[PDB]
């Protein structure tokens, strides 16, 4: 087989997270691509060099090396600094180097099992007739696969309009052909919920009790970039969306992977591919966060997400591969930006989609340059 | 001979009077309905219909309201197209000398026949009674209810205190207390913030914890949905004017959050107390875009924890509620300059300064009629 | 010859301006297209019907008729209501009806001479070797053609960075081939200056003393939509830009024709065509304006205009006609939006260009539908 | 024996002292240089160099400034990274008992040897003298200069009064007056707003109109670039804190526009007057992004006309400048609620309320040292 895996992590830490992250990746021979930023100290580079001598295929390109690559691809202004958007550099590097699997992780996610890399290789099994999970309302709650206290929760990016009636939705499973290209692993401890839910019930994920599922066409669930494997064919549609666009004068943040998770998902289903949820599960002791500041950052995107998701269901895409389908998606977002209505759809909210669509096509143009 | 006046501001057609009048009419209480510019003519016909049925109801037109406010040299204090107009009802009940002022919304219905009698507890006077204290200085009134699917906190409860509140020690002992504010509870949709409602959509099944009187140093937010205020404490119960931007985002839905805390801090300075529990109302809350509620509440939520912490460091002065409320207004202006944090932009600080002026404009009008 | 002219005016007035505007248009047989809005009272329709019986070819389509046409062209959300942007409806109608000349006017511009329509027909003379005016700094001040008190002024939309050194620029005239397709007539009384200049010196235009000029390639001057003739071939690039986009949280306004005037100008010079300034001159008793409110509306666009104009000079366009060249221009604006730098270039400022570019291509798509 | 203290706040390297020290050193005046956090160490070396040459110059570090402001219970009054820090120099000169406080910028250079002597006019006391009045209530000080290419108005002059000002009647007659503020004029780049500078780029060639003393009811903006204030009037000369948003846009560059009008309205209430004319300085203004200046000035320009009109309707109270300035602060809070217009959003009104508190915080600090 010889399935190559590259893990992508962007960080501003001192590199101490490598002590618990390297053994699972070293034993599998996977490559770790660490993306530092301008606000990243020199202790990270020393930590990578130490773990490299311990047998870890780790690379940590300086911002000078990153900017050289991005300048040669005619995209010097695509990826901003002082931002976790720089993980797109690791996406690009792994794709250029021909890795089969690109595993997006954060610097505070720790694998809980020895088969972490092997479980993420499921995005390489190809099309198979397999149990496929469908929902009557078109949504799946991946947090229902976990034991969560003190009450049930939905993942960050799950639409709010669908949450009340989701308990009455019918969940069915049947044997159908499917081609898994995205694998969203779950998380113990602090699950990936939005700031609203974390401020309200402070959820704690005890265990992974529901197994794994593969979602049918028409059944969606948000996908984050914290513990997610993407097959190299689907990576062109996995661009981490640039944040900072104001919605009614309030800049949005923390939703770069909410859009990327839905975008690669809509593109995958158009191409007959599927998204998987379940193992491998990581432990998430989330970084120290001002929850009221997280809330202030997430609300601008939360006010628009339900309308964007509804219009995406009514807009069929075109394309024969992920590059074409992602570009078709960018054009569909611009049409949605002018057709959608609501109090939150101020002129700057509509312009957010138009600028995002340009950046999406700037991302695809860079991939076409190396290809 | 205890007199009660119920204050409700509304833009509805008046249909809520059918289920609200019987409990008020049987007790002989006055209902003061405050219409707005966006209030249709059907409300006035509904008030006239229930008045002939024996209900002491008054519904002053916006012209009569503005004439009264001009005579008190406050023509710009209370805006239109806003539930801030309930302040007009507060003022009228106070001018007419009512003992109890019950603040209600047009979608709260009493569940018992003794609704008015239970709210009269703000007239009992000082006596040694069971008083509830908390080690962290906060009491969760929603813990007095059976709520599904999980425990919630009331709207306006500080967020920094919520995680460690489960480990707080709650104690009760016989101490002198003088109840001047009675916040009645609510079944159905409880008064939680938009954050909690978006997350768990709570449902209040029953009132199971009884009633409590909070000790000095133990606080809990008081809303204006089902709350009796004794006439002495009414000057400090001014409904705060919303619309001030915090980082360019105008705040809303927290006018009674500040008023409930302000009357509470003033009452404890004067040796008075706040009660929580009965009488309980049924709350089928009006339709609400919850994401819009969230957008309206976040600006105030970002400042409330800091404001509450500083209010504990600032001793007040005053011999009555008018003097203590004015002393509070000056305390807010000092806090506005000493507080620090990411959310404390120049417009956030200026929000406290303009609020302080409006508080003293409210007290100035009360001193005019008095 | 038989040169057909259609005058386009959008208004919310009662139609009294027709008493002094109709005779100059009736005597020339030109068509007047009045574009009402939702905030336009019924007295305007009665005024048009009265002048129609007096011999004026005037049409005043209701907003129901306008929305029907725009819906059939698959652009129901392009043109907003309660906005002078609705003059685009008159642009479209005149273009559909095959008029040679489209004269954009406001409801407070009155022709001062009997040859008003004939002078605007200059955009139909075709290519000729004629005196062409060039400037060493690349800018021409059309207000220098007027007698203005109490001091010299620049027109609204003239870049501010070029104003100090413009007095040292060399102006030269020589016989060169040129093809005039846009004719910007001048204005007496209150000239078209920005709110900054009007608040500062309150200029008064006494007379037109400088004659007319035809600008060379590389020499630019802003063109407004108050007294401007556009040949039907160049009209596709004359779309009135939609205002309301925030710049640092402040919505821009009053610059819809500043962008359209520069856009049709850049497109015309790419196609070897030219812009003319001078006669016919109108009288402008400007409507009552809160000058401080005009200032508050214009500053957001003024903060970006100099940078946009500078980058447009460094970006060569493509296209064989105005439709292709305008679409090429829209793509160039999106590249400029990401390359430009400055304190005023917040995320919403950059997104203003991206949404404008989409609306420009939505405009061209509607023209391609009728064509 | 009249003592003069010059107040300059700067972030430069101190090179401006070479052309500023001779006129100040020959007069024995004190120069109080106020550095900021963004001030390099070269300024302190330049002050020490000119001190050995005979100049009475002091340059307190930010630590010494903050220690003094803590002792006066105003640690949060004056922000850093702002020319608002000139208020520290105002305070120090007032504490040290100087008769004349001359407010200057680090790019204003005296053109004559009698610069300090001319500014001493704020010490002459009351006397019958030629006093200039205007029928519209405004005087254009730039009309005292030869300006090209066209006539301009000073920064802070109201815009609604500019068109009809040419028809205003200007008269002069012998009346008692007591000059307490002397605004010296400026050659080169005159003090116009960004609107005027962007439009005509004025150049002031000479001072040709002499000097004038304005009558009661005739106003003209006073800046802090070349202005002497008598120590009695100094309490009302507090440099207003900028940064408050007006419709989400923070205001700047108008701190001395409000201070110049505030000290002026206070002075006339106490029977004192403002003088315009000599001594004139040369102004090679520092580099400025003019479109950025415009963006900073528009928020204040949108409110100034309304504020000035209402200040004429509001009689002040007070026996000295401290009491009159505090009375002015309360007048601003009443205006903030009575004024109407498109630019008067909630944050615009709250701007006046926070400014009023800061004014009383300034006066409270002065009452502490006194
Ligand atoms: N390059 C870069 N990465 C950042 C920056 N700030 C945070 N990150 C990374 O972003 C990743 C995800 O952030 P995290 O706090 O775990 O997200 P959350 O758990 O969903 O709230 C972490 O691995 C951080 O190291 C930054 O300024 N630059
Ligand atoms: N005067 C006035 N009252 C209003 C307006 N809008 C709402 N209200 C009243 O405000 C009261 C409280 O509102 P409500 O929706 O019950 O608040 P919630 O239950 O906490 O979400 C209701 O009784 C309404 O009648 C308005 O525009 N003007
Ligand atoms: N359709 C429409 N036209 C408008 C509206 N407001 C103004 N106009 C028109 O816009 C045109 C130009 O406005 P004008 O005040 O003359 O611009 P200015 O002289 O450059 O300041 C006028 O003919 C107005 O009739 C509106 O709300 N809707
Ligand atoms: N303390 C302090 N002073 C400053 C700062 N920026 C500017 N200044 C001072 O403010 C004074 C007036 O500024 P200036 O550019 O001359 O204003 P203008 O001539 O009206 O445009 C100058 O003397 C500067 O030294 C700052 O960040 N901190
Ligand atoms: Mn994390
Ligand atoms: Mn309610
Ligand atoms: Mn006009
Ligand atoms: Mn200066």
Author numbering:
A (entry chain A), C (entry chain A): 4 to 374
B (entry chain B), D (entry chain B): 5 to 374
Excerpt from the publication:
Members of glycosyltransferase family 75 (GT75) not only reversibly catalyze the autoglycosylation of a conserved arginine residue with specific NDP-sugars but also exhibit NDP-pyranose mutase activity that reversibly converts specific NDP-pyranose to NDP-furanose. MtdL from deep sea–derived Marinactinospora thermotolerans SCSIO 00652 has been discovered in the antibiotic A201A biosynthetic pathway, generating GDP-L-galactofuranose (L-Galf) from GDP-L-galactopyranose (L-Galp). The MtdL subunit is divided into three regions: the N-terminal region (residues 1–111), the core region (residues 112–291), and the C-terminal region (residues 292–376). The characteristic DXD motif (Asp109-Asp110-Asp111), together with conserved His287, coordinates a Mn2+ ion, which stabilizes the diphosphate of the nucleotide.
Then, the complex structure of MtdL bound to Mn2+ and GDP at 2.1-Å resolution was obtained by cocrystallizing MtdL containing 0.5 mM MnCl2 with GDP, which led to a clear electron density for both the GDP diphosphate moiety and the Mn2+ ion at the active site. In the Mn2+·GDP bound structure, the Mn2+-binding site is formed by Asp111 at the third position of the DXD motif on the loop following β4 and a conserved histidine His287 at the end of β15. This Mn2+ coordination is slightly different from that observed in other GT-A glycosyltransferases, where both aspartates in the DXD motif coordinate to Mn2+ directly. In addition, each phosphate group of GDP coordinates to Mn2+ through a single oxygen atom, as shown in other GT-A enzymes. In the MtdL·Mn2+·GDP structure, the α- and β-phosphates of GDP interact with the side chains of Asp111 and His287 via a Mn2+ ion. In addition, β-phosphate forms hydrogen bonds with the side chains of Gln229, Arg257, His287 and Arg289, while α-phosphate forms hydrogen bonds with the side chain of His292. Structural comparison of GDP-MtdL complexes in the absence and presence of Mn2+ indicated a major conformational change in loop A (residues 288–292), which follows the Mn2+ coordinating His287 on β15. By contrast, loop A displayed two conformations in the Mn2+·GDP bound structure. One is distal from the diphosphate group, similar to that shown without Mn2+, while the other is in the vicinity of the diphosphate. The side chains of Arg289 and His292 on loop A formed new hydrogen bonds with the diphosphate of GDP in the presence of Mn2+.
